[PDB]
Ligand binder design. Structure first.
Ligand SMILES: [Mg+2]
Lengths: 97, 67, 190, 254, 237, 79, 135, 169
RNA sequence: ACAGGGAUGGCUUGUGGCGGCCAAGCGUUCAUAGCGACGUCGCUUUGAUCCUUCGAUGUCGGCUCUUCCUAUCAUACCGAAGCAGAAUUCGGUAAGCGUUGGAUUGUUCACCCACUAAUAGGGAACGUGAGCUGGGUUUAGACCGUCGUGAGACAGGUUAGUUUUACCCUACUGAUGAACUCGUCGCAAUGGUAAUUCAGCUUAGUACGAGAGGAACCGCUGAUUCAGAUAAUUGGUU
RNA sequence: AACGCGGGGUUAAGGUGCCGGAGUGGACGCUCAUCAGACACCACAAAAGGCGUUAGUACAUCUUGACAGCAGGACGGUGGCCAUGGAAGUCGGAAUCCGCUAAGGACUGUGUAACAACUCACCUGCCGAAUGUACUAGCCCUGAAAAUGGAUGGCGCUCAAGC
């Protein structure tokens, strides 16, 4: 028989299985779509999370109630020493990917 | 042919004439032939021809067929 | 019941060149060239006489015999398009907010673009891109009239249909709100 | 305010189709003979009660939406009599209420019988009997429903006339310039034409004089004969002249 | 806006410029649309659609026949009865229904169980058909009420038809004379099909040959009241 | 309908033994009951059925009618 | 228009249904017992709750007898549960309090006793006009 | 066991079971007119009589008002009154002259103001508590009708401090 | 107490029955009977009354949680309606996404109240049946009512009262892992899949409207429900 | 179709596209299904609904020109009678005839406050040869369905591997 009171489901099925990641470094699953008319650029970088802190921001957001006012916001600091480029991988396109 | 234009039935008084109109026209012409001295043939080409009513009224002693 | 033989004929004017190969019809006239692929319909094309194109179907059903009439009208409309052309006049009418129609020609794509502003006071700008080969002008003889001309009847009529469909009144009584762009006349350029 | 908020009045067959489609589609329809008799009784009882409740809701909406002639200002009450024949009006609404009450009685009787039914076939026959009797009762209402829908549309298009404010009421024979005057002093779209009885209804416009709102009432013309010889068009003007405390502007063309 | 404002708007401004062409084209597409609905609708909507189309075809054929035949009361009544709604009006002493389906006692009575234990007593029987209890009826006390005739199943009136006069009148039931299945069913007064009941015929205006007023006659029940929710009877005349 | 993009539960054409047996029994019962109403049918039936005749599009209907009339004349002369 | 005001940033809701708050106007009521909150969504088992600047529906438990038999709209003007504003300030009042209004937002009384919140004063201009202290 | 449910042919099915004469009817009508009510007498067994021929007819105004609606609809159908095919031209008026109309308007306005004052003399409110519905339950009234159906004598008990208050008419 | 035996179904759905008449058609034309859809006609308060509630043999629930059906309440799109505008009504495609918080047990617990976009209906049990816990419900104690001379039974009413796994197999959720040398960087078959609804500013007091009233596309800003993270700050926790 | 254990031959019912032994066998047709059909007969279900597709039957029109169109006519008594504030074929009620006719209703619809205006029935001209109506028989679609994902046994099959 039917459920008398409707309630939405606990949790999302888009994040299954709820298992440990297979690697510790995060994997870039998708890169931005390449446009040959744009200039050459790198699409990603690496860093190390240092922690969080607090700021005060002067807000220019027309329409918002906090327009032309100071807002207190949390931020995350990522320590980013420069990376070193040491390689080059080429990819061909096949009917298997 | 199942696919077919549907014919509308006319819920009006006047029906189609048929062969009886043709026989009546034949009899009228063949009985008006001996009563008159002359028979003229006239033409009205690409005309509205609604003034033949006035022509019939003006020539009341004649007989006009426009069949 | 299968009919042994069925035939249609298309007369061709003196200034029109028609070439058919593998059921791909190419018709050229004083105004340009039209092309259409008719390979979806089984038909035997031939030259039964000087200036006459013959269409035949052999051992066909009633539906197969009937498709030749559509092919005949299509090729005839192509011949009319390259000889006289096709012209659709549209009229835009309004009650309170004047409809502003701007016609541009895109140099990159070669197609015309029609922009409609202030339709019942709406702030959106409606943009319709014409099919290639369709020329759009704003008439100077009459008031609030667009003229769409071309060689392809399907292209001209579908472009006029697009302009008619994009200016649609929604959630209003259409006995009261009469605003829109409507096809007012259909005919030939010449 | 006006009477534009009356919901539409369906015909008898439309009413039947609406009610039975709601019963068909808003309730489960599959019941099995192998189930328990209490379950089968509950299924058919729910069908009967829901059909009655839909009928009662629609009938109550019709009854409570239409104006009550006893509670109106005498101008509005007599105008509604002139336009719609208060006798026919009240008879139609009384028939609607009587059919609503009879449908509720039928529902109670067949629920009481379904308490004692002993098989799915008997329960099914009792449900069909109940719904068929409701359908016959609704089908007996064909002429009142058509009349009430016409009255509803006319009432929705009536002008809004406040009987207790500043008002200038224009009267006279036809073709003397009443509509021309009302057009010249107000914004009302009342037609001006050279033939008699161009205006067949009460029109109303508004104006401002010394920061006060005045309403101006254009009427159909009146002829010179006693009241028993006047048609409804002239009696609109007569009712306006009789029941509205106004400034009467009697127009003559010399 | 006031009065016929949409009509005035049509008179002053017209309609939309394509309204006539759109209406003509939709009417022209109606034939294809009707065949598509006949071949593509499903379920109850399709069944109701088909019954409606059947009705319109019948009415159209009737109108066609009337237009073909354009070019071509019953009982004597007095003048004061003219133009009124009059009824149409159409040894072995056998009733119209001499045999019906017999009702067994298991179908007639259900067992009413009593007691607080798991094993119940089962002596009380409830009558599952409509009954007539008669005037001055007081129910037996519960300790001695073997047969239970519930109040929601008791009837007092019946729709009785006079076969000669062709008139159906709602009459009071006077008694139950003979239930064809069982004398016990007669004694309990069960109203089932084929039952002879006594009805009050005062509203029918029946006068005997001696001038006395007949106010009680026999009718036979011609329907199934337990399935019907009403009693339908035919006078035995 | 959205049948192509989102089809529903299929209507199975696989029969069950119980339903096949029940349908066979019901068909046999209907045949016997129809025989019973046929043997107690009170509807009138003609001794001789209405014969359709000769089709019009048969090209030799006229000479066949000539043959019929000639056969009638010969039978009348013989009798 | 329903009673929920527009342009309100998210704050902590300290007053669920069943809370009794003070009455901060001179309408005659002393306390307001919350029975519903305007704009509360649908969630299984979740009590509807209101914060400062919200319109709730309330009955009067203590006050004049004519007010005791009706359901009045009220606006919460003070709450004791601490909440954060966009300027980073966490703050709270020493009591929970509201004022009786109509559905359009005009006050039933004529004066407000004690301060009101900035959220309440900004969302309801009549409360802003009858507030002696805005905090 | 399924019995044979058969009705025999009998001449008694086609006769009159109960007959009454005009003298007997007239005597019963006189008794009906003469009957009075005595609280100290009780009815023990009703006489089976054709009461429709014995009791007096409905009142004159009731007999007219039960058929006024049907009579008006027979005189004027709904389709001829209002609608696209309506043929109604003269309205029905309760006045005949202009002076009568003026007086009628005055009395109508006075009565309308009187009704408005009466209605004025006579934030939404909270719902009534369900404790005050007690005594009106379907189960309780099923019990009441069961007791009434089973009882011959009914003792209706009244509080001496509020008899008409506790009386159940 | 003992010995044993047990625990209607390709059903259903939206439009009553009885009686009469009409009836295209089916039959019949050595009998003019009999069937008969569509219909129709008879029985079953001038918007009233509120002083007529008509029988438990059949038992339902609540909590938690997942999924499906569509017979759609809301959201999206569309057709029609005197649909001016606003608000709607009827209908169509559509199950993607939601569908709540309470009062009332002197009772078929079903009806009220509010919020809300909306507070739609069902199945997977009830075509017998080990999750937890309230009622039909009923071992032994006890009392009142009815019946019986009585043991006792019941039309009944009340009170108190013993089943207490999991470590097994499968399934499910996670965690390791042999064989291919160890490692780093990758691809992506297949499986899962995610957002939702409201409000405010502007358009605009504009279109429309006699008046009262009164939108929408584009643009902008918040909030509801859901989901995934996080701990700078504020609370809680020691 | 009846039975000891074996070998060889031939069949029955059923089958021969693959699973699967045996034919993508032959002839003439029919049918395209938005979950066809392939073991149906019973029910849903009816004299049922289809502008699906073929085969027939009956009646009718047709070079004295049929069916479809296009160009034109569609008139006079007469604004027929009663009624209506108004009502002229076209809000209603009842009648519904004559003339001129080649033909044209005291009018089939749109329209007007009422007229006007347009349109239909019917007639003529242009054209050019076969059609129209209703029934019958086949095959196809609809003719009511719930709830885990599934079943002509499965793949799959469209001048079939369906009938
Ligand atoms: Mg005038």
């Amino acid at each position: 028989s039917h459920r008398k009171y409707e309630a939405p489901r606990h949790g999302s099925l888009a994040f299954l299985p709820r298992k440990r990641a297979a690697r510790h470094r995060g994997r870039v699953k998708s890169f931005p779509k390449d446009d040959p008319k744009k200039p050459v650029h790198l699409t990603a970088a690496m860093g190390y999370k240092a922690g969080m802190t607090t700021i005060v921001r002067d807000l220019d957001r027309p329409g918002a109630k906090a327009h032309k006012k100071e807002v207190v916001e949390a931020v995350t600091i990522i320590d980013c020493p420069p990376m070193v480029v040491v390689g080059l991988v080429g990819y061909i396109e096949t009917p298997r990917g | 042919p199942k696919s077919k234009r549907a014919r509308v039935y006319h819920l009006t008084q006047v029906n189609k004439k048929g062969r009886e109109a043709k026989e009546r026209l034949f009899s009228n012409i063949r009985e008006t032939i001996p009563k008159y001295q002359h028979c003229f043939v006239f033409s009205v080409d690409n005309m509205r021809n609604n003034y033949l009513k006035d022509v019939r009224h003006e020539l009341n002693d004649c007989r006009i067929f426009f069949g | 019941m299968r009919y042994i033989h069925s035939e249609e004929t298309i007369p061709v004017p003196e200034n029109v060149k028609v070439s058919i190969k593998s059921r791909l019809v190419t018709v050229e006239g004083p105004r340009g060239k039209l092309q259409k692929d008719l390979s979806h319909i089984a038909v035997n094309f031939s030259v039964v006489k000087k200036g006459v194109i013959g269409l035949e179907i052999h051992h066909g059903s009633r539906k197969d015999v009937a498709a030749l009439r559509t092919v005949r009208t299509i090729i005839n409309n192509m011949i009319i398009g390259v000889t006289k052309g096709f012209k659709y006049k549209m009229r835009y009418v309004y009650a309170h907010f004047p409809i502003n129609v701007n016609v541009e020609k895109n140099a990159e794509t070669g197609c015309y673009e029609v922009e409609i502003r202030n339709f019942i006071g709406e702030k959106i700008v409606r943009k319709v891109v014409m099919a290639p080969g369709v020329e759009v002008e704003i008439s100077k003889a009459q008031k609030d009239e667009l003229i769409l001309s071309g060689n392809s009847l399907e292209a001209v009529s579908q472009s006029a249909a697009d302009i008619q469909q994009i200016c649609k009144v929604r959630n209003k009584d259409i006995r009261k709100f009469l605003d829109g762009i409507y096809v007012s006349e259909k005919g030939n350029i010449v | 305010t006006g009477w534009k908020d009356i919901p539409p009045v369906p015909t008898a067959q439309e009413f039947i189709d609406i009610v039975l489609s709601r019963t068909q589609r808003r309730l489960p329809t599959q019941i099995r003979p192998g189930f328990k008799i209490s379950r089968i009784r509950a299924f058919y009882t729910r069908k009967v009660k829901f059909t009655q409740e839909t009928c009662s809701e629609k009938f109550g909406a019709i009854i409570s939406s239409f104006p009550v002639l006893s509670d109106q200002h005498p101008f509005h009450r007599d105008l509604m009599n002139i336009l719609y024949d208060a006798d026919h009006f009240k008879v139609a609404l009384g028939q609607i209420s009587t059919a609503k009450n009879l449908i509720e009685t039928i529902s109670r009787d067949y629920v009481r019988l379904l308490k004692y039914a002993q098989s799915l076939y008997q329960c099914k026959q009792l449900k069909r009997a109940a719904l068929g009797r409701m359908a016959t009762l609704i089908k007996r209402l064909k002429d009142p429903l058509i009349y009430l829908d016409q009255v509803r549309q006319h009432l929705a298009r009536l002008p809004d006339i406040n009987p207790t404010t500043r008002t200038l009421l224009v009267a006279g024979f036809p073709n003397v310039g009443k509509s021309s005057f009302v057009r010249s002093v107000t914004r009302a779209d009342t037609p001006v034409e050279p033939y008699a009885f161009t205006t067949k209804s009460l029109f109303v416009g508004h104006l401002d004089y010394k920061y006060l709102r005045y309403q101006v009432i254009d009427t159909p013309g009146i002829l010179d004969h006693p009241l028993e010889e006047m048609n409804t068009i002239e009696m609109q003007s007569v009712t306006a002249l009789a029941h509205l405390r106004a400034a009467v502007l009697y127009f003559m063309d010399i | 806006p006031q009065n016929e404002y949409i009509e005035r708007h049509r008179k002053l401004h017209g309609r939309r410029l394509d309204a006539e062409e759109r209406a003509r084209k939709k009417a022209a597409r109606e034939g294809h649309k009707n065949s598509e609905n006949a071949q593509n609708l499903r379920g109850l909507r399709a069944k109701l659609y088909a019954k409606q189309r059947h009705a319109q075809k019948i009415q159209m054929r009737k109108a066609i026949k009337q237009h073909e035949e354009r070019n071509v009361p019953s009982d004597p009544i007095p003048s004061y009865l003219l133009d009124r709604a009059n009824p149409t009006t159409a040894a072995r002493f056998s009733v119209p229904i001499p045999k019906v389906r017999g009702i067994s006692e298991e179908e007639m009575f259900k067992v009413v169980k009593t007691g607080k234990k798991t094993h119940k007593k089962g002596w009380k029987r409830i009558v599952t058909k409509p009954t007539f209890v008669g005037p001055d009826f007081t129910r037996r006390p519960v300790k001695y009420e073997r047969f239970i005739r519930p109040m929601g199943l008791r009837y007092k009136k019946a729709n009785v038809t006079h076969p000669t006069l062709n008139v159906t009148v709602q009459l009071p039931i006077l008694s139950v004379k003979k239930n064809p299945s069982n004398p016990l069913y007669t004694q309990l007064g069960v109203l089932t099909k084929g039952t002879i009941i006594e009805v009050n015929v005062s509203d029918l205006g029946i006068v005997t040959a001696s001038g006395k007023i007949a106010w009680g006659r026999y009718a036979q029940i011609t329907n199934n009241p337990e399935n019907d929710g009403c009693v339908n009877a035919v006078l035995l005349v | 309908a959205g049948t192509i993009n989102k089809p529903k539960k299929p209507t199975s054409k696989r029969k069950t033994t119980r339903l096949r047996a029940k349908i066979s029994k019901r068909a046999a019962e209907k045949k016997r009951k129809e025989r019973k109403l046929a043997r107690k049918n009170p509807e009138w039936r003609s001794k001789l059925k209405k014969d359709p005749g000769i089709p019009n599009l048969f090209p030799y209907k006229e000479r066949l009618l000539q043959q019929i009339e000639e056969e009638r004349i010969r039978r009348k002369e013989e009798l | 228009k329903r009673g929920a005001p527009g342009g309100k940033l998210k704050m902590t809701l300290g007053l669920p249904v069943g809370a009794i708050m003070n009455c901060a106007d001179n309408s005659g009521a002393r306390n307001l017992y919350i029975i519903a909150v305007k704009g509360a969504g649908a969630r299984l088992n979740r009590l509807p709750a209101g914060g400062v600047g919200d319109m709730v529906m309330a009955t009067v438990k203590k006050g004049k007898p004519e007010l005791r038999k009706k359901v009045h709209p009220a606006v919460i003007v003070r709450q004791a549960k601490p909440w954060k504003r966009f300027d980073g300030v966490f703050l709270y009042f020493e009591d929970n309090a509201g004022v009786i209004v109509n559905p359009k937002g005009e006050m039933k009384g004529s004066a407000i006793t004690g301060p009101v919140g900035k959220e309440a004063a900004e969302l309801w201009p009549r409360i802003a006009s009858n507030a002696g202290v805005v905090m | 066991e399924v019995p044979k449910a058969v009705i025999e042919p009998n001449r008694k099915w086609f006769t009159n079971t109960r007959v009454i004469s005009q003298d007997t009817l007239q005597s019963f009508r006189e008794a009906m007119a003469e009957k009075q009510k005595d609280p100290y007498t009780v009815l023990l067994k009703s006489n089976k009589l054709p009461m429709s021929l014995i009791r007096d007819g409905p009142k004159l105004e009731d007999g007219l008002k039960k058929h006024q609606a049907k009579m008006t609809i027979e005189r004027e159908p709904f389709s001829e009154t209002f609608g696209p095919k309506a043929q109604r031209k003269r309205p029905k008026l309760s006045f005949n002259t202009v002076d009568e109309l003026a007086g009628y308007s005055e009395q109508s306005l006075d009565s309308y103001h009187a009704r408005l004052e009466e209605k004025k003399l006579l934030s939404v409110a909270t719902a009534k508590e369900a404790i005050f519905n007690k005594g009106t339950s379907k189960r309780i009234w099923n019990e009441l009708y069961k007791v009434i159906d089973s009882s011959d004598v009914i003792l209706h008990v009244l509080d001496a401090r509020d008899p008409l208050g506790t009386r159940c008419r």
